[PDB]
Amino acid sequence: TDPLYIKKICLEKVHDWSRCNEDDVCVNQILSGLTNQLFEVSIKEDTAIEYRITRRHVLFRIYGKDVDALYNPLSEFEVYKTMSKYRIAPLLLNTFDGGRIEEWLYGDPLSIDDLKNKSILVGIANVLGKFHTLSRKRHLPEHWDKTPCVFKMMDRWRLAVSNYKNLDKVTLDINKYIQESHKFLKFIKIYTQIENIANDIVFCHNDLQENNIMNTNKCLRLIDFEYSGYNFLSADIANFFIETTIDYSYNAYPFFIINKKNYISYESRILFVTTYLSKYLDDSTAASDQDIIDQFLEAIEVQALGLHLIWAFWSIIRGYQTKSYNEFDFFLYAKERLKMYDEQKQYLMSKNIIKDYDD
Numbered sequence: 001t002d003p004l005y006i007k008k009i010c011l012e013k014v015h016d017w018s019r020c021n022e023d024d025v026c027v028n029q030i031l032s033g034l035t036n037q038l039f040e041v042s043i044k045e046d047t048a049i050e051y052r053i054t055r056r057h058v059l060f061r062i063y064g065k066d067v068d069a070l071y072n073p074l075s076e077f078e079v080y081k082t083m084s085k086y087r088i089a090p091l092l093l094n095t096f097d098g099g100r101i102e103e104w105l106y107g108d109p110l111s112i113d114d115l116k117n118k119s120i121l122v123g124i125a126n127v128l129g130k131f132h133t134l135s136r137k138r139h140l141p142e143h144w145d146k147t148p149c150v151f152k153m154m155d156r157w158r159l160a161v162s163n164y165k166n167l168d169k170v171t172l173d174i175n176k177y178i179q180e181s182h183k184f185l186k187f188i189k190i191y192t193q194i195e196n197i198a199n200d201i202v203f204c205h206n207d208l209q210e211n212n213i214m215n216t217n218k219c220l221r222l223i224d225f226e227y228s229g230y231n232f233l234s235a236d237i238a239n240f241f242i243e244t245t246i247d248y249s250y251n252a253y254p255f256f257i258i259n260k261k262n263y264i265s266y267e268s269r270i271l272f273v274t275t276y277l278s279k280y281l282d283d284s285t286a287a288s289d290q291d292i293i294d295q296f297l298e299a300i301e302v303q304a305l306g307l308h309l310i311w312a313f314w315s316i317i318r319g320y321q322t323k324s325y326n327e328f329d330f331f332l333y334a335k336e337r338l339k340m341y342d343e344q345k346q347y348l349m350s351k352n353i354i355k356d357y358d359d
């Protein structure tokens with residue numbers, strides 16, 4: 001929170017910033033969540049060229065809490081260090097007591113409007129396909145839990161919502177969707193055993209939204225790996241497909257807009273899956289069979305069903321963590337995700353896809 005202390009740390013822990021002093025450093029907090037105290041720390045451009053500083057900016061990350069950030073543990077840093085070493089995440093620069101300093105990526109995150117740009121969608125599928133090949137093209141730490149994160153996130157966040165006194169939701173029954181959570185996990189265990197490319201277990205980002213894809217214009221880069229891990233690759237794409245209908249940049253209550261009509265078109269979904277497999281299969285990309293594509297798209301819609309329950313639980317816990325100092329309406333967002341679960345589940349049953357789901 002102290003700005004002068006941030007300057008004193010960066011002057012000490014960023015190389016050749018020792019030439020500068022506190023009155024050459026600018027500290028600017030950037031919007032994020034509350035598990036983050038992210039700052040844009042820079043050296044004033046006038047001083048930066050006469051001293052000839054080449055690294056003008058850095059990302060200053062202050063770890064928030066430890067069990068009030070009840071989402072990841074300390075495994076976040078070990079995963080981030082791996083992603084940093086393989087030049088996938090922003091380069092780790094240094095660490096300090098309470099947080100770390102990361103390479104500053106110039107540019108802006110993608111907007112909700114950029115997701116309508118077909119060349120942007122193709123560029124995202126290219127990056128995602130190349131990214132999902134990491135587990136098989138390089139050596140990941142052998143002790144990592146290979147349990148798909150769709151199970152871990154569903155379990156560890158459904159248990160947190162379980163212990164909450166009288167939710168008094170809109171349409172009351174939070175335990176209805178707690179029971180629905182068990183039905184999805186029991187179903188998805190059987191479903192993902194069908195030999196489908198979309199059921200491949202790879203290292204996934206697990207939070208693919210537009211505000212986590214940087215448009216450096218040099219390329220498209222991923223950030224915010226706090227939830228990344230092993231998962232069905234179709235869960236990463238389903239998250240991105242869902243996020244084309246959610247606009248977080250609205251600046252009045254409830255600070256987001258759901259436009260379900262803006263869902264990525266069927267043609268764009270085919271183009272995305274076509275471009276994705278062109279880089280994920282890498283070699284014999286000829287598996288752009290239409291039967292294979294209609295199948296990728298099906299498993300994507302199945303994973304989307306559980307994602308709504310996963311992120312509704314996440315929002316409920318985020319609502320109680322923010323309990324009485326609020327702006328974003330996490331509880332309304334949780335309802336919108338639960339409503340998306342009812343609509344997606346009814347759409348899946350209308351096509352007879354989630355058989356033996358027990359409703």
Ligand SMILES: Nc1ncnc2c1ncn2[C@@H]1O[C@H](COP(=O)(O)OP(=O)(O)O)[C@@H](O)[C@H]1O
Binds near residue numbers: 035102223
């Ligand atoms: N290395 C970086 N360089 C530039 N901007 C960053 C960097 N890391 C994060 N940001 C900015 O911070 C915002 C949120 O950070 P993020 O890591 O996504 O935290 P969270 O999503 O948990 O709040 C992003 O919208 C992005 O603009």
Ligand SMILES: [Mg+2]
Binds near residue numbers: 211224
């Ligand atoms: Mg983010």
Ligand SMILES: [Mg+2]
Binds near residue numbers: 033207224226
């Ligand atoms: Mg995050």
